[PDB]
Design a protein around this nucleic acid. Structure first.
Lengths: 832, 63, 114
RNA sequence: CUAAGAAGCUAUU
RNA sequence: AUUUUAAUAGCUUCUUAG
């Protein structure tokens, strides 16, 4: 049992199976072992890092212990195979990559020797030796010499998400390709990196089909951008990390030299230059004044150089001379609630009448150690035709709306009591920064940020919240100007999703007034034998690929076809990638650099997490559908879906609308979903998930292993085996079925220790006045109504304890009166 | 009855914060570490050793 | 006016910092570019007036800095203050194995360019 | 005087 | 010192009804 990549008329896919005289043309080339090896092939090393599960991971174990990368006594240690708890596993993976370079250069010597010979033929990934030899021929064809074509899409496209894990291009940083020789040395002042990057692409990837452009402003559509940036993730690890980012320019005004940006050299999006440039300023205009004040190039030159060894990240400077740390405050105890809580015969031992959750406190150095949690971010770079099919299937989950550009007269603010962001947050709030300019100036700054790029500064400080695990999470905070462009550029679709009742995306709509019965009736829509799933992503804010964030941002702006041209969208995408992906983030008086992932303070954050969750859902279904045998599944429609799917990925170049609509029909009909930004319940047909037509737990385990590189344990996920009772946890609520009236209504109830824990631990001594706690305790009484119908008695005792303490506080200070149950049962009537 | 150990510990840490002894950070890291060790316990006499150590701490200083 | 006061505060922000800038050293690094365009991350790296390093424990100081002088990034430096979290000057003859239980860590150093 | 609906402000879970 | 979503309670204005 090995792994094979098959393109036949019967069965197509990538799965396990049960298993001429052209040699005298290629007999004098140093790439073919002579005919009549190594036992394990290269595609098994492709497969076992893509299809990983514990218990059947033996093949990976002899592949690692064969080639002297590891001994066999590191593996009797418990908990060895996870990135999040074993940080030393990345070293023993990293010893493989020189054989990967010796593979790829041998394929370059295969392809260049093939094109001069005159052979038209298609290459398959399973035929490689692990040393570098190719051996399996037998389906090629002859032509005129010097005109034969290679078809190299499938090998390179499936090879992509392991090269940046195994670090195959870390050996280009030497002098002349030997490991024992010293490293290559550059002059510091280089910033172009165009000619030698292009000859690197015509050294390693010389016979690729579509034209790579090293810059992205030259590009012609909204699909060469993902192509060029997905190549540019891999090439941007060779070059030293000083020479990436913003650039400088010398300018004279008021007798004083200054410094200002003129363009950016991205990790991914190539080289862009400013079309507006001035040699001297004669006066001052407030648009360019905000441009100059938003730049931290004015802060970076006036700081001391910083060398940090606390973390493993790159640094630029420290803005002030003095470094200080701050501490997380602990909380306060309500002894009146506990003192009356023991008077009702409660808080014994010998039972579960106790408490679980508490407040926690953190030291001064917790904050920089919470920044250190970005070290699980890795350079990851994904498949190119698979993502090209995912980016068209995800368009039909969101083409039920209307959206476009607006003006400053029709922008809707929610609140004006916020923070501002560095360096603007020392003088004025957001209200002062909307009171300054006019409508014509906001039209001008919409027109000028389609011509120029702006940098910002992320402020960070801490928050206080209730936890069940000793941990802190801090905040992220974005400055004004990118958000103020972002409201104008996106706010129509932001309100258009959040005002339609009943869809796949479930944000906006409410659990009260009989909404939860409509929720779970939309879940169980047209299925036949349903069970339920559910999961939470392990530290999703601290680790994310950059291709998934950029492809999530490009999906959310398909709608502007009547207002702007391509360059305006290019400057908006460049400002988005400069403000959410790699921004010089500050953590406590020191200007660091962010490796990549979502900030937790942007305007378009949670909807990007929702389409991100949709992206792992649809990649999990296509990865489960491709990786099964075609000689078992009974239905002919599924088999034709499989063959037209694999042809639509790896043999076509344009889009096909009909298969996108048919695949959206299948995924609507049999894998119905409900997602609110991290947390899902899905409703799978249980006749198929044992057979293998849709996803399960294990495919989500595998796809989070290879594309996201964070392990998810089996204890966090779950599966419910009943139609009647609902999900086990869904946004930390529990589900039962309650008779009320003439039918049965789903009343969702919380954890009881949350209700017992939210009252006695308040965070402020000033909050021990009852003026806020009367509506706080009656809102908790609304939240703790559906424990009354539960057949265990202690939660009804908790409900009556809260009722008597509400009566005590009302003495100390029917239908419309909240001190009877007739008011609270009116809240869950389905008629408003 | 062992929730009373936790409520006495959190009201004594509320006392010990407003005594203003945070600036000497070396004892404060150990005190917050043992406070986190108090709240995740299951036996009582080990927790009784932990709370008589914390009463020794809050009767030790004259802040 | 609010507009005039935010223009005033932004004006004195962009004019009161011009001390390390308006130097000859920015001209010393800006002159040899092909178009007067240099990457921003090596703007401080040639012309830093100071270096400050945070140190977490004893063994990283055994690897990193010894004596009064050391070398980072083809430049010589000379160490003047070493300071802790209580903002006191900790001394140089005391830093060894024999005091590593007692004192309070992490530490902050500073220097000047030779 | 009251009920219903819509809009703006403060404050909470 | 973040962003988005709903619910309650309180104020005020316009409209409709006796």
């Amino acid at each position: 049992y090995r792994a094979f990549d098959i393109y036949n008329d019967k069965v197509a896919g990538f799965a396990k199976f049960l298993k001429e005289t052209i040699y005298n043309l290629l007999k004098d080339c140093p790439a073919v072992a002579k005919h009549d090896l190594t036992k394990y092939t290269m595609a098994d090393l492709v497969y076992a890092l893509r299809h990983f599960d514990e218990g059947n991971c033996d093949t990976l174990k002899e592949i690692l212990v064969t080639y002297n990368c590891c001994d066999d006594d590191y593996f009797n240690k418990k908990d060895w195979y996870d990135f999040v708890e074993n940080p030393d596993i990345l070293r023993v993976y990293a010893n493989l990559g020189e054989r990967v370079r010796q593979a790829l250069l041998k394929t370059v010597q295969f392809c260049d020797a093939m094109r001069n010979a005159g052979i038209v033929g298609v290459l398959t990934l399973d035929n490689q030796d692990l040393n570098g030899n190719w051996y399996d021929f037998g389906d090629f064809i002859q032509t005129t010499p010097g005109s034969g074509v290679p078809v190299v899409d499938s090998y390179y496209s499936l090879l992509m998400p392991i090269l940046t894990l195994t670090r195959a291009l870390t050996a280009e940083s030497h002098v002349d390709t030997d490991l024992t020789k010293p490293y290559i040395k550059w002059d510091l002042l280089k910033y172009d990196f165009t000619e030698e990057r292009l000859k690197l692409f015509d050294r390693y990837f010389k016979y690729w089909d579509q034209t790579y452009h090293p810059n992205c402003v030259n590009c012609l559509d909204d699909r060469c951008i993902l192509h060029c940036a997905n190549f540019n993730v891999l090439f941007s690890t060779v070059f030293p990390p000083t020479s990436f980012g913003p650039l400088v320019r010398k300018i004279f005004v008021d007798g004083v030299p200054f410094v200002v940006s003129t363009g950016y050299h991205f990790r991914e999006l190539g080289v862009v230059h400013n079309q507006d440039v001035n040699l001297h300023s004669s006066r001052l205009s407030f648009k360019e004044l905000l441009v100059y004040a938003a730049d931290p190039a004015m802060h970076a030159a006036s700081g001391n150089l910083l060398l940090d060894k606390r973390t493993t990240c790159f640094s630029v400077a420290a803005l002030t001379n003095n470094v200080a740390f701050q501490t997380v405050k602990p909380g306060n105890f309500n002894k009146d609630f506990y003192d009356f809580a023991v008077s009702k015969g409660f808080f014994k031992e010998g039972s579960s009448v106790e408490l679980k959750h508490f407040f926690f406190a953190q030291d001064g150095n917790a904050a920089i150690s919470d920044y250190d949690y970005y070290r699980y971010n890795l350079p990851t770079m994904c498949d190119i035709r698979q993502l090209l099919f995912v980016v068209e299937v995800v368009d039909k989950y969101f083409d039920c709306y209307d959206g476009g550009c607006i003006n400053a007269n029709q922008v809707i603010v929610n609140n004006l009591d916020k923070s501002a962001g560095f360096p603007f947050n020392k003088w004025g709030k957001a209200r002062l920064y909307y009171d300054s300019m006019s409508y014509e100036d906001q039209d001008a700054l919409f027109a000028y940020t389609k011509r120029n790029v702006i940098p910002t500064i992320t402020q960070m400080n801490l928050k206080y919240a209730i936890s069940a695990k000793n941990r802190a999470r801090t905040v992220a905070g974005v400055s004004i100007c990118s958000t103020m462009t972002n409201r104008q550029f996106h706010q129509k679709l932001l309100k258009s999703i959040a005002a339609t009742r009943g869809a796949t995306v479930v944000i906006g709509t409410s659990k009260f007034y009989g909404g939860w019965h409509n929720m779970l009736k939309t879940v169980y829509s047209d299925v036949e034998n349903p069970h339920l799933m559910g999961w939470d992503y392990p530290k999703c804010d601290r680790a994310m690929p950059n291709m998934l964030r950029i492809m999530a941002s490009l999906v959310l702006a398909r709608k502007h076809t009547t207002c702007c041209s391509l360059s305006h969208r290019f400057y908006r995408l460049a400002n988005e990638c400069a403000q959410v992906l790699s921004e010089m983030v500050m953590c406590g008086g020191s200007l660091y650099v962010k490796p990549g992932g979502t900030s937790s303070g942007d305007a378009t954050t949670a909807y990007a997490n929702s389409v991100f969750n949709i992206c792992q859902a649809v990649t999990a279904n296509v990865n489960a559908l491709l990786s099964t045998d075609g000689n078992k599944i009974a239905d002919k429609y599924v088999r034709n879906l499989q063959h037209r799917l694999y042809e639509c990925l790896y043999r076509n170049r344009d889009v096909d609308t009909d298969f996108v609509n048919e695949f959206y029909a299948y995924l609507r009909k049999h894998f119905s979903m409900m997602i609110l930004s991290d947390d899902a319940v899905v409703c799978f047909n249980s006749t198929y998930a044992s057979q293998g037509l849709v996803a399960s737990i294990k495919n989500f385990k595998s796809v989070l292993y290879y594309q996201n590189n964070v392990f998810m344990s089996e204890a966090k996920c779950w599966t419910e085996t009943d139609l009647t009772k609902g999900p086990h946890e869904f946004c930390s609520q529990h589900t039962m079925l309650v008779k009320q009236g003439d039918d049965y209504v789903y009343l969702p109830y919380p954890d009881p220790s949350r209700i017992l824990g939210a009252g006695c631990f308040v965070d402020d001594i000033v909050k021990t006045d009852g003026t806020l706690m009367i509506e706080r305790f009656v809102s908790l009484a609304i939240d703790a109504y559906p424990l009354t119908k539960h057949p265990n008695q202690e939660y009804a005792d908790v409900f009556h304890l809260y009722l008597q303490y509400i009566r005590k506080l009302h003495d100390e200070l029917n239908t419309s009166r909240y001190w009877e149950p007739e008011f609270y049962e009116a809240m869950y009537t389905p008629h408003t | 009855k062992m929730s009373d150990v936790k409520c006495t510990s959190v009201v004594l840490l509320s006392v010990l914060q407003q005594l203003r002894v945070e600036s000497s950070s070396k004892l404060w890291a150990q005190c917050v570490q043992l406070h986190n060790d108090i709240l995740l316990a299951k036996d009582t006499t080990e927790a009784f050793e932990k709370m008589v150590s914390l009463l020794s701490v809050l009767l030790s200083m004259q802040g | 006016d609010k507009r005039a006061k935010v223009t005033s505060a932004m004006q004195t922000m962009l004019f009161t910092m011009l001390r390390k800038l308006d130097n000859d050293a920015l001209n010393n690094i800006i002159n040899n570019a092909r178009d007067g365009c240099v990457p921003l991350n090596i703007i401080p790296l040639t012309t830093a007036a100071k270096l400050m390093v945070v140190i977490p424990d004893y063994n990283t100081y055994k690897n990193t800095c010894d004596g009064t002088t050391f070398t980072y990034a083809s430049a010589l430096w000379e160490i003047q203050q070493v300071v802790d979290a209580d903002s006191k000057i900790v001394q140089l003859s005391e830093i060894s194995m024999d005091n590593s239980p007692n004192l309070a860590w992490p530490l902050i150093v500073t220097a000047l360019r030779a």
